[PDB]
Amino acid sequence: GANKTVVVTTILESPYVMMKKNHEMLEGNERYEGYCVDLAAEIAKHCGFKYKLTIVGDGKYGARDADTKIWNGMVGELVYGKADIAIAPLTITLVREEVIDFSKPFMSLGISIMIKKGTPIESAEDLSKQTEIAYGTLDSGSTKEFFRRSKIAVFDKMWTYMRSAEPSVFVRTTAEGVARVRKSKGKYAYLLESTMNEYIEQRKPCDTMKVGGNLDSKGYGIATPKGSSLGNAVNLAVLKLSEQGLLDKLKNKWWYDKGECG
């Protein structure tokens, strides 16, 4: 039947989506800016739909509760029919691919280490071989599941530590992890995606840094509910944006053009 306004689920995560200063009482999509705001506009333009940006209600990426089996976060909003599409730094994973559809990736990333400058840590192996410096991840996302599932000896040992460390090494939001690194005088390191890490490293007060290689190699994808009418066209649009150089332009706009650290 008639076209409907597509409900887009996304998450307040710098530099992907941020509320514009003093727009708290304005209306609609114009309230937000960032990489995924720009990406949403292009994907809608190429696919021919109108859309509304909405912030995921529970502030989470998406994980399945072990007991209840209920999906939360943006994945949940797609699975239970609360949104039509997720346009966010949402990691393509097997367990998610089983319940929702992903486009081809629009970014690359890997899990990485953030330290406060001067922290004597250069690698995951370094972190795993000491106990003075605490370390954790975001509490309900793909990074935590990576450690939970890994059979690689260094990551397995890291998980054995994190899962029972006190106080909890896990955080609710990327911002909380970053703030914890910055206030802990070097006694907390944060495990997060390289994209987020590299962004923060170029933001004032310029006191964090990415160290070592990425622990893995994966992508973000645009997600739709299984059997969505949008999935095919969205996939082709991602490839077009890739080949036209648009995804590279948006990366350079929101990371490197935004740099504050010289």
Ligand X SMILES: N[C@@H](CCC(=O)O)C(=O)O
Ligand Y SMILES: O=C1CCCN1Cc1ccc(-n2nc(C(F)(F)F)c3c2CCCC3)cc1F
- Bind-site residues for L-glutamate: 89, 91, 96, 142-143, 193
Residues tagged in the binding site annotation: 89, 91, 96, 142-143, 193
Q: How many residues does the chain have?
A: 262
Residue 146 within binding range of ligand Y, rule CB under 6 A: no
Q: Which C-beta is closer to Zn ion: that of 42 or that of 145?
A: 42
Cβ proximity to its own copies, 30 vs 97, nearer residue:
97
Instruction: Give the span between the Cα atoms of 64 and 155, in whole angstroms.
Output: 22
Instruction: Give the contact letters, 56-75, x = binds to ligand X (CB under 6 A), - = no.
Output: -----x--------------
**Backbone φ, ψ for residue 92 (5° rounding):** -75, 120
- Residue 7 site contact among ligand X, ligand Y, its own copies, none (CB < 5 to 8 Å, cut-off depends on kind): none
- Residues from 128 through 157 that contact its own copies (CB under 8 A): 146, 149-152
Please count the other Cβ atoms lying within 10 Å of the Cβ belonging to residue 248.
Answer: 11
Per-residue mark of binding to ligand X, 1-40 (x: CB under 6 A) = ----------------------------------------
Q: How far is the CB of 244 from its own copies (least distance, A)?
A: 8
With contact defined as beta carbons under 8 Å apart, do 56 and 10 qualify? yes
Beta pairing class for 51-55 and 85-86: unpaired
Binding site for its own copies (CB under 8 A): 92-94, 97-98, 102, 104-105, 108, 146, 149-152, 216-219, 235-236, 239-240, 242-245, 247-248
